[PDB]
Write an enzyme that holds these catalytic residues in place. Structure first.
Site, PDB file in Angstrom:
ATOM      1  N   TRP A  68       7.612  21.599   7.913  1.00 38.38           N
ATOM      2  CA  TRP A  68       6.739  22.670   8.382  1.00 38.38           C
ATOM      3  C   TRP A  68       5.392  22.111   8.798  1.00 38.38           C
ATOM      4  O   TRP A  68       4.345  22.498   8.279  1.00 38.38           O
ATOM      5  CB  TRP A  68       6.564  23.729   7.305  1.00 38.38           C
ATOM      6  CG  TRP A  68       7.857  24.230   6.784  1.00 38.38           C
ATOM      7  CD1 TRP A  68       8.447  23.888   5.612  1.00 38.38           C
ATOM      8  CD2 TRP A  68       8.735  25.168   7.419  1.00 38.38           C
ATOM      9  NE1 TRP A  68       9.638  24.560   5.465  1.00 38.38           N
ATOM     10  CE2 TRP A  68       9.838  25.350   6.564  1.00 38.38           C
ATOM     11  CE3 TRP A  68       8.693  25.872   8.628  1.00 38.38           C
ATOM     12  CZ2 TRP A  68      10.893  26.204   6.873  1.00 38.38           C
ATOM     13  CZ3 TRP A  68       9.747  26.718   8.938  1.00 38.38           C
ATOM     14  CH2 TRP A  68      10.830  26.877   8.064  1.00 38.38           C
ATOM     15  N   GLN A  84       9.299  44.389  22.914  1.00 42.27           N
ATOM     16  CA  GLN A  84      10.382  45.020  22.200  1.00 42.27           C
ATOM     17  C   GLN A  84       9.838  46.148  21.331  1.00 42.27           C
ATOM     18  O   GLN A  84       9.353  45.902  20.239  1.00 42.27           O
ATOM     19  CB  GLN A  84      11.076  43.973  21.344  1.00 42.27           C
ATOM     20  CG  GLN A  84      12.297  44.477  20.627  1.00 42.27           C
ATOM     21  CD  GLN A  84      13.374  44.928  21.578  1.00 42.27           C
ATOM     22  OE1 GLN A  84      14.323  44.196  21.845  1.00 42.27           O
ATOM     23  NE2 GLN A  84      13.232  46.143  22.100  1.00 42.27           N
ATOM     24  N   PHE A  85       9.914  47.384  21.816  1.00 41.39           N
ATOM     25  CA  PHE A  85       9.347  48.539  21.109  1.00 41.39           C
ATOM     26  C   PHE A  85      10.218  48.995  19.971  1.00 41.39           C
ATOM     27  O   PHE A  85       9.780  49.773  19.139  1.00 41.39           O
ATOM     28  CB  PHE A  85       9.169  49.729  22.050  1.00 41.39           C
ATOM     29  CG  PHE A  85      10.470  50.372  22.469  1.00 41.39           C
ATOM     30  CD1 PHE A  85      10.951  51.486  21.810  1.00 41.39           C
ATOM     31  CD2 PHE A  85      11.223  49.845  23.513  1.00 41.39           C
ATOM     32  CE1 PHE A  85      12.152  52.066  22.186  1.00 41.39           C
ATOM     33  CE2 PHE A  85      12.428  50.424  23.890  1.00 41.39           C
ATOM     34  CZ  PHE A  85      12.890  51.533  23.231  1.00 41.39           C
ATOM     35  N   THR A  86      11.463  48.541  19.952  1.00 43.00           N
ATOM     36  CA  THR A  86      12.403  48.982  18.928  1.00 43.00           C
ATOM     37  C   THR A  86      11.981  48.510  17.539  1.00 43.00           C
ATOM     38  O   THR A  86      12.526  48.940  16.519  1.00 43.00           O
ATOM     39  CB  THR A  86      13.823  48.497  19.232  1.00 43.00           C
ATOM     40  OG1 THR A  86      13.790  47.100  19.555  1.00 43.00           O
ATOM     41  CG2 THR A  86      14.381  49.260  20.394  1.00 43.00           C
TER      42      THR A  86
END
Lengths: 155, 148
Positions: A68, A84-86
């Site tokens: 990382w 992406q509004f979902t």
């Protein structure tokens, strides 16, 4: 704002063409290694919200070396940003969703484009890729891990 | 528990040059994050949702048919990174211990097949590095956290 971040070996974005009439899809956008960010713009979103995303998005050290360690920028990788509004899809009610907190398209679209500009400013014009807003898309993602990161800037 | 749900035309799950172990056509791909303080009620809620949320259209009737309605598949993949603390290098404090997580996870997968069909649930190789080729259909991305 809400983002789902997927580490990828690549991504291939297509959209349905307008006057189709007896192929229906069209690749408009493609990346190799990098991130794919599904972006959910909230109605009550401030530009500070956008900034935070654009930051964690371009900065989280999501690749090894030590684990990382390096971010997308460090490795000279691409990002693909897709509205992406979902995400704001409420599903606590029925077993059917409900997108009321999702900033309404015409305002959302501008906010979105403003974000994409910032991305290129902060990073590089050639590294940010997008979809066709509000259009039905078809995305071929090659998940590398997978590594999935979720962020909600209303925390 | 936390889930990211992706509506897909298909996906191919593989491990290490590469071994295909799991594949689906239309359906959902569910990235599942098991929280340390997760109860089996948490698991149930997820299972209810992935299996009953109507995420497909009836040309025009959008959000009409759920995965089972269409006899579609689900691919469930454990993904602890959902519990990444990002407040600029990750921090998975909140994940549930692997050895425990794995069992909980298998238990969930069993439930899935019970509730649905043995042949419709697919999975990955737990804790292994995987390579997933997803074809997102929309996209349609749904996020849930049972801790709500």
């Amino acid at each position: 704002m809400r983002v789902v971040i997927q580490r990828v070996k690549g991504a291939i974005l297509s959209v349905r063409k307008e006057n189709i009439g007896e192929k229906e899809l069209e690749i408009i956008s493609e990346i190799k290694n990098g991130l794919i960010c599904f972006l959910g713009i909230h109605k009550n979103d401030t530009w500070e919200d956008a900034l935070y995303i654009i930051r964690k998005c371009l900065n989280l050290r999501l690749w090894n070396n030590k684990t990382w360690d390096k971010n997308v920028k460090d490795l000279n990788y691409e990002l693909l940003i897709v509205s992406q509004f979902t995400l704001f899809g409420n599903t606590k009610k029925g077993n059917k969703p409900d997108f009321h907190l999702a900033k309404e398209p015409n305002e959302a679209l501008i906010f979105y484009n403003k974000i994409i500009d910032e991305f290129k400013k902060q990073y590089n014009d050639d590294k940010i890729k997008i979809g066709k807003f509000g259009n039905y898309m078809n995305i071929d993602v090659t998940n590398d891990g997978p590594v999935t990161i979720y962020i909600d800037t209303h925390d």
